[PDB]
Assembly symmetry: D2
Homo-oligomer: 335 residues x 4
């Protein structure tokens, strides 16, 4: 079976590609090498096995259509995207072209030239908006949603906030609708935070890795900022848990096609920024000092209620936050 990974030299993509390579799956990677680290990732993958690398711009309809027609993949992980909320605010046009435009270029090519292709799309918890319709409590280290003790499920109201939220949300709904109307085999994952090796976090994207870099410099002598008070919460999912989800879901596509699933590390793996700092301090014997910025354009809490996916395919995260965090630290140091 042929597997195509758009954005294959990115964090998620490179991790998935490596599994594909280890499983002997014929792999096609499509990326523009725009993310700092993508080139390194590509070099690393090449050291793992042989595959087809196709440089291309997801925004370009011709590039995308030729990719599909030429390789006719059996399955595809559509990860090429504009990933930062901050950049979407400064460059909404690019964000729209990449996330909405790129997704539609892929959907149209698939529909017209390769309709049986199984597609998994990485959406976001931002399609849910600010989540201010619920009530929260504030403790010493974090906020808590009184109404949704175990996280939010797919029945949560859609309300796209920020251009990134609107472009991913539009792509999300089109993915789901192409399954209904045109019979495409699509699957949508509304993802909460992810972290792991091959992630080249930045100030604008990859909060967990970013703060690890923070803890790393501190360690080698190099205040930083935090948006808001640090008590905002996100469930954190390690790359190892993401790989299993992708491949397992792909293998069960016939059963789950046409649905969206909330994906995250779950309540047990929930962390506030403050809580994340503790952990790092405690591992590296350090002190993370910072200044405050106003709250971002932001969910006080985001925890996925994964009953849906668990029930469908029996997947659950095996990597705990503490564990994954130390490993993330180790990897960051490694750079």
């Amino acid at each position: 079976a042929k597997l195509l990974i758009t954005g294959g030299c990115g964090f998620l993509g490179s991790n998935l590609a490596s599994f594909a390579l280890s499983q002997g799956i014929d792999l096609i990677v499509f990326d523009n090498l725009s993310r700092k680290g993508a080139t390194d990732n590509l070099h690393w993958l090449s050291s793992l096995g042989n595959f087809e690398f196709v440089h291309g711009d997801i925004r370009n309809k011709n590039d995308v259509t030729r990719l599909i027609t030429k390789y006719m993949p059996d399955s595809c992980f559509h990860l090429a995207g504009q990933v930062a909320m901050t950049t979407s605010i400064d460059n909404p046009c690019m964000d729209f072209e990449i996330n909405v435009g790129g997704t539609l270029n892929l959907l149209e090519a698939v529909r017209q030239y390769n309709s049986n292709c199984n597609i998994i799309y990485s959406s976001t918890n931002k399609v849910y908006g600010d989540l201010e319709q619920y009530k929260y409590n504030e403790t010493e280290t974090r906020y808590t949603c009184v109404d949704k003790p175990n996280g939010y499920d797919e029945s949560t109201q859609l309300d796209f906030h920020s251009p990134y939220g609107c472009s991913k949300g539009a792509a999300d709904q089109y993915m789901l609708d192409y399954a209904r109307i045109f019979g495409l085999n699509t699957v949508v994952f509304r993802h909460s935070s992810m972290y792991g090796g091959r992630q080249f976090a930045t100030y604008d994207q990859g909060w967990v890795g970013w703060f690890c870099q923070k803890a790393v410099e501190i360690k080698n002598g190099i205040p930083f900022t935090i948006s808001g008070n640090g008590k905002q919460v996100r469930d954190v999912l390690h790359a190892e848990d993401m790989i299993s989800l992708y491949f397992t879901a792909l293998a069960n596509v016939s059963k789950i096609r046409g649905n969206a699933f909330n994906i995250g590390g779950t309540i047990v793996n929930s962390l506030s920024l403050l809580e994340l700092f503790k952990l790092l301090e405690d591992y590296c014997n350090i002190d993370m000092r910072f200044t405050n910025l106003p709250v971002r354009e932001d969910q006080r809490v985001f925890v996925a209620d994964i009953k849906k996916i668990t029930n469908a395919i029996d997947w659950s995260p095996k990597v705990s936050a503490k564990d994954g965090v130390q490993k993330m630290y180790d990897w960051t140091s490694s750079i």
Copy 2:
């Protein structure tokens, strides 16, 4: 004030444009003349007064950008769109380009070059999906929604169905988010069925108007036997063009208070009709028999769509004044006039 109406030669657009002309508001109309009857409306508006007509394609960024910088409108009703669900299924790329691409072209131009421009966007009831999460009952002439007897409000779950639903839904969310993020003055109306003069209905767009045309044909002994998709018990509240005009202008006048919000708009439960009920109204008014054949029900369809308008009425205290009976009679008269 200068008012820009994109899709200004269409059904809603020309009605709104006529009002602007009568009230001395300076008008700019932008349209590509693609809708059959658009040329007729343009001609009709031209005889009503003077205004700036700008032929253009909303999908074209340069056309849109130049329009905004050149005229710098104070307000704008963004009505240009791909309006047929059917067409959206047959040509999803076109639907996406016009509805999403075109809306973003306008948003970007206003954001960058004329940020104070007020914008009202004509969205749809299709952003709510099939609404099968609710409970229904089937009566003799219609389907009734048991737990939402007065229609649906803005708290209904968004679930874009059909490419038309997806394109209008994406544009809808972008309009709301631009108010939030970039401070634009936008308003979104999620509309249910509208009908009235200047509407040149077709098989796949303007159900009330199309069925009125079927009646006119029958009345004149024209054999062009028709169909309905489903059993005809599906319901929609219908809103007359006169009420649509008052809503747009009233809303505009209160934009400062309503900016950044979406409102479900419709004729309300009292003006709702199933196709079977519409047929009866026509048979009574015209002294005819509406014979038809049933086709399978539509791919994407809502058994019932009635807007609960508490939100808009509470904000601007606008409410529909034209009854379904009265409006449909008027509509038949207009149709027969063509």
Copy 3:
């Protein structure tokens, strides 16, 4: 056989379309109705026969590709374009998108899905630049090219001047290259001035028609004093629509022998006119005095443009039959009739 005419509701297109209708050739007209008068031409054509009218934007790849796949025409006259040099200077982007992008949209659709389609493209004399490399003399009524007494042939050096010249020249070259590389059956006509019925001239396009309009007004006691750019001695050979119809259809009938070539097309030296000469003809025909004011010469201009048509006459034996004096009188009459 099906014939597709892009730009089918314009001046050339409507004339060509009408002939197809009369000869019973299956016709598809593709147009966006952007040129004023396009709707009138469309209505007019509608009164001559039946055909498929497809509203669309040549700049839009999807509209163009669908058009080809859906109708699979056997021949096509590609006339949709941005025709004004002034507009090309004020909006080079649009000019480029229409003329280069639109032509490429068509070329690619044909190449991939209907490679046998014969295509005739209407290029321009502007691909030859200012022509200042030749020598000229000036008389009391016009300029004359002393080294090119029979006009310019296809051997003249290409030098695109103006964005219009650049967009049309790029399309022209692509048309010819697609015949070479991809084996398409293309023919390019580098046209000099054309005029005739169904042409709704404006200040910016259709100089002959424009000045005829000026004469009608004066005739009719109307005052809209006008201008000319430069001294009025600049010359153009003028070709009447009647000759143009025969050209296109005769050429189409001989495509196999002429595919992959460019031909200079015009009324020829015998039909060359300067603006001053044109005024004189009109004053005589109408018994009026044509007063005007002179403006600076247009930046991008040819003092003389006359087509040396030996190549096309040798290939298909077509030659213009309508003289300038006779054509202009006819044009005046058409103009007055409007």
Copy 4:
């Protein structure tokens, strides 16, 4: 002064960028890293100085416009392009979007927001067509243009052959017209073959480099093909002369704005593929074995630039001999 180089990680771009860094010029590099070796060139340049690297797609109007408004360069070398004729035949759509669309994206941004920007465009000899209107002569090793012993000048008829010729040609004419119509400071170079370090030749583009490679591959024990008989000729211009040409032309922009110039190694630096093969064989003590394919599309039998116009304008002239540059190219290639 700020210099923006589009296609800055490519062969010409990296060479020009290194020089700029050496002169202490504020540099902006724009590239999508599509060419194989681009990432390598980006890494190589990185240690030469500080500069701004902007990843972007020239096809994308938004990327290009933001680039111009954000950096407001004083000068620009527009090298981002679809460089292969072959590939243009296989993907004319892409060739058109990159060469024509990309160039108009740049010209529009400059026209509207940074109109004094000086721009040098790298066009091609392919805008001249097949050149069959001339008379040739075959010798044992090459073809000769009987009517143009010193090469072709700017007065040669324009006739764009191949989609690449059409796309580059349209962009070339637009560059010149924006100068006349909009007062832009543009210069067009109709370039014949260039080669040197930092060039990552492929089957499709970079003939001298490609064959050097061919040379390397063999010597290292381990067939290749040639399109036509190998007697076709090109003048070859080394990277060193290209660098001087660019910077000198840029410095003299006020006097050459709005013009096109044919650029090449000149006749003394002309080579046929067969002659190049000797070069290597000797220089390498080897035998270059190949199979023949049909002649490339519209391929010119002879392309030698008559540089009188440019020499008269800025007195630039190539100083690197083919023998010399080719040997060094060989050396450089073997070193990779």
